[PDB]
Amino acid sequence: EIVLTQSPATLSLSPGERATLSCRASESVSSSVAWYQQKFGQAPRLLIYDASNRATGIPARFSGSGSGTDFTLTISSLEPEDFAVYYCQLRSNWPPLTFGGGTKVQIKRTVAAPSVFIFPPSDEQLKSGTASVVCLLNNFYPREAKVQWKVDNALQSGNSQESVTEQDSKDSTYSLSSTLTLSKADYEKHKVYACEVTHQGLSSPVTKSFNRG
Amino acid sequence: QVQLVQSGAEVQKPGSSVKVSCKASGGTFSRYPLIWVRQTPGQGLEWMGGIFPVIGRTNYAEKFQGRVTITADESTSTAYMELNSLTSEDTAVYYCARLDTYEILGYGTDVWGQGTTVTVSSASTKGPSVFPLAPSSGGTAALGCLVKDYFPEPVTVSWNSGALTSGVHTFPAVLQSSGLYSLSSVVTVPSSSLGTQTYICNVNHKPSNTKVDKKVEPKS
Amino acid sequence: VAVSGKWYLKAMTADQEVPEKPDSVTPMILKAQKGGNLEAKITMLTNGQCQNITVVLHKTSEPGKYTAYEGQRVVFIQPSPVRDHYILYSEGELHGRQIRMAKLLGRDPEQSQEALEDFREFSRAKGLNQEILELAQSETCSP
Numbered sequence: 127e128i129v130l131t132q133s134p135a136t137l138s139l140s141p142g143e144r145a146t147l148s149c150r151a152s153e154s155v156s157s158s159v160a161w162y163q164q165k166f167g168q169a170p171r172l173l174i175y176d177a178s179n180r181a182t183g184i185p186a187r188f189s190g191s192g193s194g195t196d197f198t199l200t201i202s203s204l205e206p207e208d209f210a211v212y213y214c215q216l217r218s219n220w221p222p223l224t225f226g227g228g229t230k231v232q233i234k235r236t237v238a239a240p241s242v243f244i245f246p247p248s249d250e251q252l253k254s255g256t257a258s259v260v261c262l263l264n265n266f267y268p269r270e271a272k273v274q275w276k277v278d279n280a281l282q283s284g285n286s287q288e289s290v291t292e293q294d295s296k297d298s299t300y301s302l303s304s305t306l307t308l309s310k311a312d313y314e315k316h317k318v319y320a321c322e323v324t325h326q327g328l329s330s331p332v333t334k335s336f337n338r339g
Numbered sequence: 340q341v342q343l344v345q346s347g348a349e350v351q352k353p354g355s356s357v358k359v360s361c362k363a364s365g366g367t368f369s370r371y372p373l374i375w376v377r378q379t380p381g382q383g384l385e386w387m388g389g390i391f392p393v394i395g396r397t398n399y400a401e402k403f404q405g406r407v408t409i410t411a412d413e414s415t416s417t418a419y420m421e422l423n424s425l426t427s428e429d430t431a432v433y434y435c436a437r438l439d440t441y442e443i444l445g446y447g448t449d450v451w452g453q454g455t456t457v458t459v460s461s462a463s464t465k466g467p468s469v470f471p472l473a474p475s476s477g478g479t480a481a482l483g484c485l486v487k488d489y490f491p492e493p494v495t496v497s498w499n500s501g502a503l504t505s506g507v508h509t510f511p512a513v514l515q516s517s518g519l520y521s522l523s524s525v526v527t528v529p530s531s532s533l534g535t536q537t538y539i540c541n542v543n544h545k546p547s548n549t550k551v552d553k554k555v556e557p558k559s
Numbered sequence: 560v561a562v563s564g565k566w567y568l569k570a571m572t573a574d575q576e577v578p579e580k581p582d583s584v585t586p587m588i589l590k591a592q593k594g595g596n597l598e599a600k601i602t603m604l605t606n607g608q609c610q611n612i613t614v615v616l617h618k619t620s621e622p623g624k625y626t627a628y629e630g631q632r633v634v635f636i637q638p639s640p641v642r643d644h645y646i647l648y649s650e651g652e653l654h655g656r657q658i659r660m661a662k663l664l665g666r667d668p669e670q671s672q673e674a675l676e677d678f679r680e681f682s683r684a685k686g687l688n689q690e691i692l693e694l695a696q697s698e699t700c701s702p
Contacts, residue, residue: 156666175447
């Protein structure tokens with residue numbers, strides 16, 4: 127089926143600047159593309175339809191253009207509430223009505239390196255027979271960061287989850303938590319727990335560690 | 340005019356079927372496309388399929404073909420989406436939408452339902468266990484609370500009963516393989532105040548009427 | 560907020576013989592007006608003369624059905640089973656005598672055989688048995 131590619135996937139612009147989102151189609155879709163906005167945890171909102179036409183009550187800032195394969199959403203000047211995810215979709219009497227992966231418009235700021243912190247599991251949890259080791263990356267920009275777990279210098283994989291905050295309303299930074307989950311038995315087999323972080327803002331990877339006990 | 344009103348939220352066990360409804364109050368979807376879209380938590384909008392009257396056929400996205408069924412009852416002015424063989428990854432919000440596409444050119448007055456949340460898990464209502472992210476041993480220090488193994492969402496974390504708000508970062512919940520959610524709340528504080536001020540996180544899980552207040556101090 | 564769409568007039572036929580045939584046609588431009596109405600603009604090249612046509616269509620209770628020339632003509636503009644194509648069927652009085660017309664509208668100017676065959680079938684079912692004329696497209700018309 128037809129595929130809509132939204133690139134770039136993230137756009138970092140300052141409030142008041144112009145934004146130019148793209149939505150390229152695998153085939154020719156003749157003026158049948160819609161643009162949606164979606165603020166965090168909210169329902170999608172229709173902005174543009176038939177490529178160029180604006181829906182009811184949609185501020186003039188929002189403009190759509192294009193035909194065939196290449197389409198564009200332009201926000202003449204970003205307002206504070208316009209930082210969100212925009213999706214393009216085939217919207218027509220004829221299927222398919224596939225969506226783009228979306229482009230996230232974010233607030234631009236200076237690079238900031240993450241503050242790393244590692245937490246051992248509690249003696250209380252170890253009773254349950256599982257152990258949660260946590261790594262905090264705090265107040266960093268941009269969002270792209272890499273975390274590596276090392277138990278006695280043995281690179282771990284498949285046993286961790288990551289969770290990230292939304293851009294701060296004040297700092298405009300992100301924070302991120304990595305939780306390594308393992309059995310009390312496995313946890314007590316090893317001594318050194320470490321957490322290695324790579325980020326744009328760090329000239330070399332940062333490692334934080336503890337020795338069990 | 341036209342209003343789309345979806346069935347309520349559903350918690351379904353892996354292997355089961357869920358059928359969401361979509362009552363059109365006013366107007367009919369005999370000329371307008373009626374589509375279903377879903378959104379995996381923290382992911383993008385996925386078109387599942389729809390009824391396309393101009394071709395006189397119901398069409399499905401290749402990703403869903405065969406697991407999903409889309410029907411409509413003109414007497415009840417209602418449309419249904421039935422997803423089969425649910426897995427934990429079908430946890431999402433399902434929308435129905437009627438598209439204003441029949442006229443050669445129109446005002447784009449599309450209509451969306453409020454959305455139906457479907458959560459796939461074998462868990463029943465359990466309140467969280469709260470464990471400390473104990474601070475490390477004149478600069479900044481970090482502490483927090485691990486809020487672990489709860490169902491359903493939501494959970495509220497506050498610090499010092501709303502007193503501490505600055506530098507607090509409560510992360511999104513993550514549905515685990517257990518079918519249970521876990522979340523972390525953390526906060527940065529001056530190192531000097533580790534001796535003087537106590538830090539308590541207040542975890543609230545209304546579904547289970549659980550309130551836990553956990554004090555976070557250096558370990559021994 | 561001038562809501563709009565660009566279409567191509569790709570074919571046309573009628574019930575009454577009108578040998579007068581365009582050599583070329585410009586894009587048909589649809590514009591939404593207040594009061595629910597819909598405007599269509601097109602230019603036709605006949606004998607090196609550019610005829611500029613504007614029709615105002617009033618929307619009815621029924622979807623896809625419009626009235627024109629002050630109620631004296633009824634126009635149905637309904638989507639074709641073929642992608643990005645519409646069929647226009649207009650019955651009623653034009654300049655005193657009864658005439659019925661059909662037009663295939665499309666987003667691509669490149670002729671679609673699938674769409675043309677549907678348009679043929681539509682025409683033949685309504686009894687517009689005369690020859691279907693495919694039109695050539697040019698972006699502008701000048702003497």
